[PDB]
């Protein structure tokens, strides 16, 4: 159980000892593997919290080469006393930054983790109101976008106290296109957002009912009813999607936004729960062109793209879906690159991830990785991660999923 | 204890009770998932329970559980084990066992076909020449002039592990690979090691790029012997492309019959170490893995040049674009020659239908997402959005070590 992982393309073998530090559970047993289940999964108690805090502080002070020091023992004492009195505790700024960077480092489903130590952490724990949240979020978006030279960032709102005072961003991402169901057939805009696009209207939004309407933010501070806010358009960088060879591609009227900013996850550090912690990076091209555009339960544009290419759509064995899919993803990359907005193709990002794995085995002893999520959704086996065995285990600090607010909120 | 899987494109949810019948182990624990690890001498002591559970299964499937035929067979196997240390399967039992080994093969996307397996009983075989003869008839029957038929040939079971039958080839038909002194490889790099063994055993190698390897056959634990499959029995398909006339000039071909010969068939505790089985190809097995893996024929670049793509930066997706064309050419060539083949769109759709049907009538269908999802265009196939439970059922096909690592040479 000092496990080894082999790359069957290069025969590189790595030995994983970091998994022995694993704490949480995977959902698998020796009788059944759940590696392909999307989600295999009230506040803590004075006795639940301190071991968690100690585990986190132990690794923090190790990482700064002060394990077993005065400063270490003092901080443990101090936190231990604050828990005993206040039934929670507060992270020093340095601990906050470390916890956030390591929650990314530990995200076994993220292919972009070679960047993990360059995260910009915005401490929003002094925030008290949704208007305040909105202000922090606009500043996030502007900093991260950086006129198309995107930078990684996280903004961290106050930690959970009793579950009645939760801070939540109700959007799944800070920037997403609206989705409206039609009186007649399918859906206009983005089908994944149809419910939220209705909870916005059903809460006051007036929708332009277009194909690419940026949704408003729905912000919840200290557990009150959430509030609608419109992100200033000049803060929302968008890329019109054209093809470098097909002039008709422009006529399809497609665009996407430059900033992927996930806002519905929960960040856990030393047992403390940050239920509102939007984080953002930059897109891998397939995220838009393969999933957002071509998933059948999304924009599902493969039909008409192939028609405009005049491919034989009669039999699946012409691979017309595959041919169109390539062209769409060529265009996405072409457009972002042409407008100088940061993006990475799936070849470069998976090659980066192999180098990152290599680094983590060398300087950390392992790297938890979820093959089902790391392998891109197109051209899987011509990327190097396909031939890479991976070990998946849960380390902390971590990002976790949490229920959608509207099913929980005492409205 | 019931378990649920969800299709995230259709919201179809299915309930698995079959995993409870699972006995073997996955390699996973609650604290580590080994879902992407490629690979994770038996006494009378443990054999009657294995026999009994298999016979219980068999007689349940024929609606005779607890019958006198069922009780008598159990008694007969029992006494045969204690007095002879092993036991022999009835013909009906072997046919059932082989079919259910295929049905249980969680990494196989082709299992909708599992009940139409032609079972050839070669348990009376005693010499390598007899093995060659049985394999020839398998190849002729399965190939059927291009109208392929699934088939398996079952050689005598292991006894003391010192008298094993083995097919030393990994597949019955496969191209040789030669390492040249300049470091380049002629032919199929996957088969360099086996090619060398054949040459050492006295095979006179043509030293071409598509030479069919000889059969290397081991009976009753004796040293293996070389045999040449009659070329009129080896159906091959020249690869051309429906629009690119230069594609034929790449000189590529492939054989029509995928027949895997290095696995071990386990039935009621009996181990069948030689059990070649065959079906027909999914297009991507040849077009994506065989031709385009960097450690295989690796033809992407030469196809990319002849297509005149931007090969300077990988964000042009020249690799993805060439990959689609190669796979179009594979499918076109096989259909043109009326050789059975299936594209990855048709095969994954069939699997989903199979899987749903198996949940209904069997209570489950063990499935290995990592292997089921095709190596190109993953998310535009329906299995990508399908949650899957992986567990181990018997009868089963298992990996076994390469015989040249374990064989005691007679000389
Ligand atoms: C900087 C460039 C980044 C790239 C290219 C990238 C790429 C990806 C991709 C392709 C996925 C697969 C999920 C999907 O397909 O929807 C993913 C998941 C994820 N990313 Fe990254 N990411 C980046 C930055 C970040 C940052 C800055 C964070 C947090 C600080 C982060 C945290 C995560 C998490 C937590 C998940 C998976 C959540 C889950 O479902 O368990 N990523 N990422
Ligand atoms: C008839 C059409 C069939 C098709 C299209 C098919 C397709 C496939 C594919 C694509 C794989 C993944 C292997 C890889 O890509 O490297 C696979 C695995 C497998 N197939 Fe099927 N198959 C068929 C028939 C059969 C038959 C007749 C058997 C045995 C009786 C069988 C047994 C297996 C097994 C045991 C595996 C897993 C190998 C492993 O665990 O490494 N298949 N199949
Ligand atoms: C920072 C960053 C950059 C980047 N380029 N891509 C990212 C993708 C994700 C991410 C994480 C989980 C997800 O969930 C799938 C799902 C569907 S239903 C229950 N779960 C999704 C997609 N909704 C995206 C998170 C962060 C990213
Ligand atoms: C009956 C049938 C039909 C069909 N169309 N495809 C099939 C593919 C496989 C199969 C089984 C294991 C394999 O090995 C993986 C590996 C590489 S290194 C250690 N393990 C491979 C790869 N060559 C193919 C087996 C049977 C098939
Ligand atoms: C490391 C990884 O498990 C390995 O490359 C697997 C991944 N999935 C696969 N899937 C199929 N169908 N065939 C394969 O050979 C593999 N190889
Ligand atoms: C059913 C399956 O687990 C689900 O579709 C997963 C598979 N792999 C994925 N991989 C990535 N990167 N993103 C995803 O949303 C998914 N979805
Ligand atoms: Zn698992």
Swiss-Prot record, chain A:
Tissues in which the UniProt entry reports expression: Isoform N-NOS-1 is expressed in brain and colorectum. Found in the Auerbach's plexus of the enteric nervous system. Isoform PNNOS is expressed in the penis, urethra, prostate, and skeletal muscle, and coexists with the cerebellar nnos in the pelvic plexus, bladder and liver, and is detectable in the cerebellum.
Q: Where does L-arginine bind?
A: 173, 282-283, 287
Record: residues binding heme b: 110, 401
Q: Where in the cell is it found?
A: Cell membrane, Sarcolemma; Cell projection, Dendritic spine
* Binding-site list for (6R)-L-erythro-5,6,7,8-tetrahydrobiopterin: 36, 372-373, 386
Q: How is it modified after translation?
A: Ubiquitinated; mediated by STUB1/CHIP in the presence of Hsp70 and Hsp40 (in vitro).
Q: What is the effect of changing residue 283 to S?
A: 30% decrease of nitric-oxide synthase activity
Subunit record text? Homodimer. Interacts with DLG4 (via N-terminal tandem pair of PDZ domains); the interaction possibly being prevented by the association between NOS1 and CAPON. Forms a ternary complex with CAPON and RASD1. Forms a ternary complex with CAPON and SYN1. Interacts with ZDHHC23. Interacts with NOSIP; which may impair its synaptic location. Interacts with HTR4. Interacts with SLC6A4. Interacts with VAC14.
Q: Which family does it belong to?
A: Belongs to the NOS family.
Entry remark concerning the domains of this protein: The PDZ domain participates in protein-protein interaction, and is responsible for targeting nNos to synaptic membranes. Mediates interaction with VAC14.
Role summary = Produces nitric oxide (NO) which is a messenger molecule with diverse functions throughout the body. In the brain and peripheral nervous system, NO displays many properties of a neurotransmitter. Inhibitory transmitter for non-adrenergic and non-cholinergic nerves in the colorectum. Probably has nitrosylase activity and mediates cysteine S-nitrosylation of cytoplasmic target proteins such SRR. Inhibitory transmitter for non-adrenergic and non-cholinergic nerves in the colorectum.
Q: What name has this protein been given in UniProt?
A: Nitric oxide synthase 1
Instruction: List the source organism.
Output: Rattus norvegicus (Rat)
Upper taxonomic classification of the species?
Eukaryota, Metazoa, Chordata, Craniata, Vertebrata
First-to-last residue of the parent protein present: 299 to 716 of 1429
